[PDB]
Structures are given as structure tokens and as C-alpha cells.
């Protein structure tokens, strides 16, 4: 069947912050921006590998996240309401209280992926806004 997954966004973390899918699973994923602040803030949800950070040539106690080198959803056909097809550079951006639901088949990309928010020049990411996606081979 279609498996329903929900990832809630809060300042500055995801619930759940860990998720496990199998290759070939039918997934319907809802990203919901449940920002609790006054005012509430926008959040990003991107699945990728290999973190890119800023560089200025000086060392940092905390590297400033700017994105993923590898997008998990590259080539992955997605359905969301009336639209079907792959989305170039797919990332989910939501104002406070907006949600977005989309469905796909988990691609043959096994192993450890990460999800993250790069907004406010990586301050959300530095504050904890990232999680881990494990892709298991089809049983």
C-alpha cells in the first residue's frame, strides 16, 4: 500500500529526526511547518548527501551549512495534487502553518542520507535543524 509519513518542522528541528524507508516503498510524505514562534518562521526540507558549508579561509567552531552536493530527489518522479513528474532541485519551502504532501517510490539509493534546512544563512542547521534518512534495500 501507500505508506503515510509526516515530518513536522519546529524551530529548529524535525519530528521525527530519524526516518527509515525501503527501496521501492510507495511513500506519501507530508512536510508541515509547525513553527511555534511569534511570528512563525519559514523552514526548508531538502534530502541530500555531502554537506557544503561557507568558507572564508579562517577556522570555525561551527561550519555554516549552505546545502547538499547530492539531492536525494534528483530524477525521482513526484506526484503532488494535480502535478506529476520529476522536479529539478526539489526542496520543500513552507511558511509558518503551511504543509505540503507529495508521493513517490523510494529510488534505489541505499544507505545514509540527511535532511536539512539551510534558511537564515544556515543558522537553523547550526541550531539543530537536520535529520537522518536510512534507505534499506528492498526485502
Residue 81, sorted as left (phi over 0), alpha (psi -120 to 50) or beta, turns out to be left
C-beta separation of 99 from 33 below 8 A: yes
Residues 107-126, one symbol each (x = binds Cl ion by CB under 5 A, - = not), give ----------xx---x-xx-
**Shortest distance, CB of residue 114 to Cl ion, whole angstroms?**
13
Helix (H) or strand (E) segment spanning residue 123: helix 123-126
Q: Does 130 bind Na ion (CB under 5 A)?
A: no
**Which of these ranges, 10-18, 38-46, 59-67, 102-110, lies near Na ion under the rule CB under 5 A?**
38-46
Q: Does 135 contact Na ion by CB under 5 A?
A: no
- Residue of 7, 43, 46, 118 interacting with Na ion (CB under 5 A): 43
Query: Is residue 33 a contact partner of residue 94, using CB atoms and an 8 Å limit?
Result: yes
- Cell digits of residue 93: 519551502
Give buried/exposed letters for 91-120 (b at 16+ CB in 10 A, else e): bbebebebeeebbbebbebeeebbbbbbbb
Tell me which of Cu ion, Cl ion, Na ion, none is bound by residue 19, counting a contact when its beta carbon lies within the kind-specific cut-off of 5 to 8 angstroms.
none
> Based on CB atoms, which residue is closest to Cu ion, 63 or 119?
119
User: Does residue number 7 form part of the binding site for Na ion (CB under 5 A)?
Assistant: no
Smallest distance from the beta carbon of 67 to Cl ion, in angstroms? 10
Per-residue x/- track, 94-113, Na ion (CB under 5 A): x-------------------
The closest of 92, 40, 57 to 71, measured between CA atoms, is 92
Feature table: binding site: 43, 117, 124, 129
Amino acid at each position: 500500500g501507500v505508506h503515510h509519513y509526516t515530518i513536522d518542522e519546529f524551530n529548529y528541528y524535525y519530528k521525527p529526526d530519524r526516518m527509515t524507508w525501503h527501496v521501492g516503498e510507495k511513500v506519501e510524505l507530508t512536510i508541515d511547518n509547525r513553527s511555534q514562534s511569534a511570528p512563525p518562521i519559514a523552514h526548508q526540507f531538502s534530502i541530500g548527501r555531502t554537506l557544503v558549508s561557507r568558507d572564508n579561509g579562517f577556522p570555525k567552531s561551527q561550519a555554516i551549512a549552505v546545502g547538499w552536493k547530492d539531492n536525494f530527489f534528483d530524477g525521482v518522479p513526484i506526484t503532488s495534487g494535480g502535478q506529476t513528474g520529476p522536479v529539478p532541485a526539489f526542496s520543500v519551502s513552507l511558511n509558518g502553518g503551511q504543509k505540503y504532501t507529495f508521493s513517490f517510490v523510494v529510488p534505489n539509493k541505499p544507505g545514509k542520507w540527511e535532511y536539512g534546512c539551510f534558511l537564515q544563512t544556515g543558522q537553523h542547521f547550526m541550531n539543530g535543524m537536520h535529520g537522518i534518512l536510512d534507505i534499506l534495500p528492498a526485502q
